[PDB]
């Protein structure tokens, strides 16, 4: 009776409507108001109507303040530390739990990494992707729940976005997972992920190989490969986790990557260990 309470109904930002879907611990008197406006870049909080053009003018830092790590012509890759930048990130995870029902903001939010996917602008950088992954070593779990604003979907951002999030995860190079229990619009996108990535990772045999030959560049375990082998209906290959081949593959959409498989982000980036491991005993 708590996680299924919607209180907002409407947001208009720019030309773009936002419908809420889940419950976030916002004050309910601001759900009582009808306007839900915000800064486009820095996300400043208010409750009034005589402040718009003046916060718009005084915000000449028209970006997200994250540490930008990789900007090509298409993507621009930040990270944010929430111990370093707090209240912006308080509301940043408040929006994600307004669109997801498995998180509550009272216990600490400081340490864990805030990876980000923007388009660059000439005014600044428009936020078009993000997620709040861990600082380190939660449950395996090399990615987290990846959420962004819903009107920049379905045209070439979100799918390859979560795939290069995974690419950064095995380019921060450790075997993990997303969340375990539930998914509503992404579990099918998760098998679209693992099929497309598996076919691109192991159309490259030229011999017989164990599955640990390719599992090192997966960030998903060797044991996952048989359930990914039976997502695509039948690819029994004289089964055994210690060796595998591939058939002369049926090739539904292996060489059909002319759509939404068009860009590559290079592994040109450093490592992001915690400088203090931060054993918070208080």
């Amino acid at each position: 009776e708590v996680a299924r309470v919607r209180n907002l109904n409407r947001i208009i930002m720019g030309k773009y409507e936002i419908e809420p879907w889940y419950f976030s611990p916002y004050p309910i008197e601001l759900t009582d108001e009808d306007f839900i406006y915000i800064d486009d870049f820095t996300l400043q909080y208010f409750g009034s109507k005589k402040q718009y053009e003046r916060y718009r003018k005084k915000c000449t830092l028209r970006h997200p303040p994250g540490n930008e790590i990789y900007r090509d012509d298409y993507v621009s890759f930040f990270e944010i530390d929430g111990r370093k930048q707090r209240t912006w990130c308080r509301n940043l995870c408040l929006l994600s739990k307004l669109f997801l029902d498995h998180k509550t903001l009272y216990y600490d939010v400081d340490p864990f990494l805030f990876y980000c996917m923007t388009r660059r602008d000439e005014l600044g950088h428009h936020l078009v992707g993000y997620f709040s992954k861990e600082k380190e070593s939660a449950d395996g779990y090399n990615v987290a729940c990846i959420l962004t604003l819903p009107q920049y979907q379905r045209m070439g951002y979100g799918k390859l976005l979560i795939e290069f999030s995974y690419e950064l995860s095995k380019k921060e190079n450790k075997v993990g997972s997303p969340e375990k229990p539930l998914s509503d619009l992404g579990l099918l996108s998760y098998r679209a992920y693992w099929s497309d990535t598996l076919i691109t990772l192991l159309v490259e045999h030229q011999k017989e190989i164990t599955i640990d030959e390719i599992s090192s560049m997966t960030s998903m375990t060797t044991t996952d490969i048989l359930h990914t082998a039976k997502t695509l209906n039948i690819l029994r290959y004289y089964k055994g986790q210690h060796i595998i081949f591939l058939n002369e593959d049926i090739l539904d959409r292996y060489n059909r990557l002319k759509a939404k498989k068009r860009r590559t982000i290079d592994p040109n980036r450093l490592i992001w260990k915690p400088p203090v491991f931060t054993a918070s005993q208080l």
Binding site: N67, D81, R83, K84, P275, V276, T278
Partner: protein, 100 residues
């Protein structure tokens, strides 16, 4: 252990400053090269009136080449200054403490 506490308060924000050593200096050098080549471009007017078609607007666009250098140094002052506030007061939080 209070100095260890404040050391893990301070290393993550003294650490992004040699990254700013990578950042803020190349435009100082490039704008300085533009300033000296531009000064060679606008010497000839003061020479020929010394022995105005370009000189004043070229000094103005020299200023456009240098005000961004100055505001980069002024933001450098700002991000030196706030962390130096907490830095010197945390040196003071060590000194007033029984630790240091």
């Amino acid at each position: 252990m209070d100095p260890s506490l404040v050391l893990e308060q301070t290393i993550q924000d003294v650490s992004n400053l040699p990254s700013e050593f990578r950042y803020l200096l190349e435009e100082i050098g490039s704008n300085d090269l533009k300033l000296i080549e531009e000064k060679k471009k606008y010497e000839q007017k003061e020479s020929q009136i010394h022995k105005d078609k370009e000189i004043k607007e070229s000094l103005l666009k020299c200023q456009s080449l240098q005000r961004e250098k100055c505001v980069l140094a002024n933001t450098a002052l700002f991000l030196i200054a706030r962390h130096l506030n907490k830095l010197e007061k945390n040196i003071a939080l060590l000194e007033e403490d029984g630790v240091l």
